[PDB]
């Protein structure tokens, strides 16, 4: 147990879940998270973690999920989906959804995907989107609309047309650079009283990764 380059990497992983109403009510929401700390420290130091709303320990040199929280109040909803459905005869279905990014322009949400579900009397789907790239997968049955990367606070609409046939909510997905829970690693004091390497002598690394689990929005 002895390294020359002393580092450690804090992983704050999340999964923000949402449940909205066609109008705009947050019928349900919460986030589940665990913090993994990948370290390589010399000796057997007793640490001091920090954060918002601080567990002390002696890290199992290697990799170990420190704690694991699960907030439910005052949550950050990374995206804001808002659709518009217009009926006609029984021939066509007018549908326009719009996603919104609610975060610091200095951050890029990636791996975005909206799934606007169609009905079973579907004959053909037409769609246009100045941004992104979508298609109507008849098997899964929906208009998978994928987006490479999207900045924050910006807007983006996708207008489709479901050609009905004579005779569910829009799910979303996304990875982010920040933690929706609001959490934040304040400090991680590395202390091995035996050996000569200090705390402000270590290289600390921390990353925030928010995944979207159940981000459905009633149509």
């Amino acid at each position: 147990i002895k390294y020359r380059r002393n580092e450690l990497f804090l992983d704050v992983l999340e999964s923000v879940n949402l449940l909205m109403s066609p109008q705009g009510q947050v019928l349900s929401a919460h986030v589940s998270g665990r913090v993994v700390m990948k370290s390589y420290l010399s000796g057997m130091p007793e640490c001091k973690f920090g954060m918002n709303d601080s567990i002390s320990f002696i890290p199992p040199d290697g990799e170990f999920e420190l704690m694991r929280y699960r907030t439910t109040k005052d949550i950050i909803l990374p995206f804001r989906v808002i659709p518009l459905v217009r009926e006609v005869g029984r021939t066509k279905l007018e549908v326009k959804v719009v996603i919104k990014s609610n975060f610091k322009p200095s951050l890029l949400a990636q791996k975005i995907e909206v799934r606007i579900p169609t009905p079973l009397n579907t004959s053909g789907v037409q769609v246009i989107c100045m941004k992104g790239k979508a298609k109507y997968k008849a098997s899964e049955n929906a208009i998978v609309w994928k987006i490479k990367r999207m900045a924050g606070m910006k807007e983006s609409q996708i207008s489709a047309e479901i050609e009905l046939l004579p005779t569910p909510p829009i799910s979303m997905n996304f990875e982010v650079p920040f933690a929706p829970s609001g959490l934040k690693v304040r400090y991680l004091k590395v202390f091995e009283p035996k050996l000569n390497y200090s705390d402000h002598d270590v290289i600390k690394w921390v990353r925030y990764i928010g995944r979207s689990g159940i981000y459905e929005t009633r149509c």
Binding site: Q110, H200, I203, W205
Partner: peptide, 10 residues
């Protein structure tokens, strides 16, 4: 950036 780490501000 999504997996890129970042130095903490002690």
């Amino acid at each position: 950036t999504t997996g890129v780490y970042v130095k903490m501000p002690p």
